[PDB]
């Protein structure tokens, strides 16, 4: 609330539609990436209180460790051929550097490794934390793979 | 686990142990009874089928393939739809899904029962490889045969 | 239960004292299920009496 009172930025409410108005495609295509992310993210003005909280956790990395829940993750492993899961990966790849957990790089790595399972495999740690393990599971220094 | 007491017995009597010859003779009697009778082995096989439906942690969830075929992309003016065609063709017969568990239970008996697929799944002399109908038919049957 | 556990030390030679099966973890249990972790704690703290 205090950073809302002092900080000089607000919503520019119409960027996400003014830009991405000028996207060009046919109407014959069944799936529209523009409308996909443009209705899959919602600005909604209440996101900013969460944003100023995420900014404010930097003062107390020691006692609170802000992370991202399971419900914002693709919750199935996703698919690279799936456009909406690709956009979900885009949202996470932007979001994840702002939090204060020490394991955000391997979150960003194993999210994409969840995104493609079947195009390849990578050498890993064990038979428990394999490539199809949930992205949020690691969250610790030792679960960082040698890969 | 099961528990038996380690104590001095009260000298009871459970008559159950036999040799292998009696079991083999009883196998001969039962198979001789069952010989060339189609509708006799089928309730036993169905009993093992419903028993395996009881025991298994696996739940057949056929909507997930509709979920993943919802995100494929194509044009609209092209009116041969492979995704909608395979959703219609992947719709089974009169809501049966027992046949998989029955086929899985049929591995217990080859010497009396040879589980073959129906001739009705074969695409009715239609071998037209341009017919995407027949092409999805070949795909379905080619996955189904090694079971 | 605490006092009869403290009391069975006297009369070990006729009656013994055990913990029931009902306070154990159900059906084995995994080291992932947090309730079974705490149940292992409760059991392992209760057993040396």
């Amino acid at each position: 609330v205090l950073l809302q009172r002092i900080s000089p930025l607000q919503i520019d409410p119409t960027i996400i539609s003014n830009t991405m108005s000028t996207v060009s495609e046919s109407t014959t295509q069944t799936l529209s990436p523009a409308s996909s992310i443009l209705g899959k993210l919602r600005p909604s003005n209440s996101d900013f209180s969460s944003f100023r909280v995420a900014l404010a956790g930097w003062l107390y990395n020691g006692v609170v460790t802000t992370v991202i829940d399971d419900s914002s993750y693709p919750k199935d492993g996703g698919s690279v051929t799936s456009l909406e899961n690709l956009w979900d990966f885009f949202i996470l790849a932007l979001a994840l550097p702002l939090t204060t957990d020490p394991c955000a790089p391997v979150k960003a790595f194993m999210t994409l490794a969840n995104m493609m399972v079947g195009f390849e495999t990578i050498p890993m740690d064990n038979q428990i934390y394999t490539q199809s393990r949930r992205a949020s599971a690691f969250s610790t220094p030792h679960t960082w793979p040698r890969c | 686990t099961v528990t038996s007491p380690y104590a001095p017995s009260v000298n009871r009597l459970m008559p159950y142990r036999i040799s292998n010859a009696e079991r083999q003779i009883s196998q001969i009697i039962r198979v001789m009874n069952i010989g060339n009778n189609a509708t006799v082995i089928q309730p036993v096989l169905q009993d093992i089928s419903v028993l395996l439906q009881r025991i298994s942690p696996l739940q057949i969830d056929p909507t997930i393939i509709s979920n993943t075929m919802s995100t494929v992309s194509e044009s609209t003016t092209q009116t041969l739809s492979p995704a909608s065609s395979i959703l219609g063709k992947l719709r089974p017969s009169n809501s049966d899904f027992s046949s998989f568990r029955v086929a899985l239970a049929g591995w217990l008996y080859n010497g009396v029962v040879t589980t073959v697929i129906d001739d009705s799944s074969y695409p009715k002399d239609g071998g037209s490889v341009t017919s995407l109908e027949n092409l999805w038919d070949f795909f379905i049957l080619a996955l189904a045969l090694p079971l | 239960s605490f006092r009869v556990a403290l009391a069975g030390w006297l009369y070990n030679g006729v009656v013994t004292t055990v913990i029931d099966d009902s306070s154990y973890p159900k059906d084995g249990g995994s080291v992932t299920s947090l309730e079974n972790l705490w149940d292992f704690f409760i059991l392992a703290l209760a057993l040396p009496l």
Binding site: - | V2, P15, Y16, I18, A21, E22, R23, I25, S26, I29, R54, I55, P57, L58, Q59, I60, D61, P62, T63, I64, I65, L90, P92, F97, F100, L143, A144, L147 | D27, G28, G29, S30, T32, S33
Partner: protein
């Protein structure tokens, strides 16, 4: 269809699930009676010859 679509529970532990699912069928003594049935079968056919 059953080949292409298959789903586990989100939190399944094998020894837990198979313990709960395999235990209550073993309170049945149905298998033991067929042994004595086969005894009487073999004794009857040797008696017959």
């Amino acid at each position: 269809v059953a080949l292409l679509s298959g789903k586990y529970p989100p939190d399944l532990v094998t020894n837990v699930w198979y313990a709960d699912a395999i235990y209550p069928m073993y309170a049945d003594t149905e298998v033991f009676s067929n042994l004595q049935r086969d005894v009487i079968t073999c004794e009857a056919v040797q008696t017959l010859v």
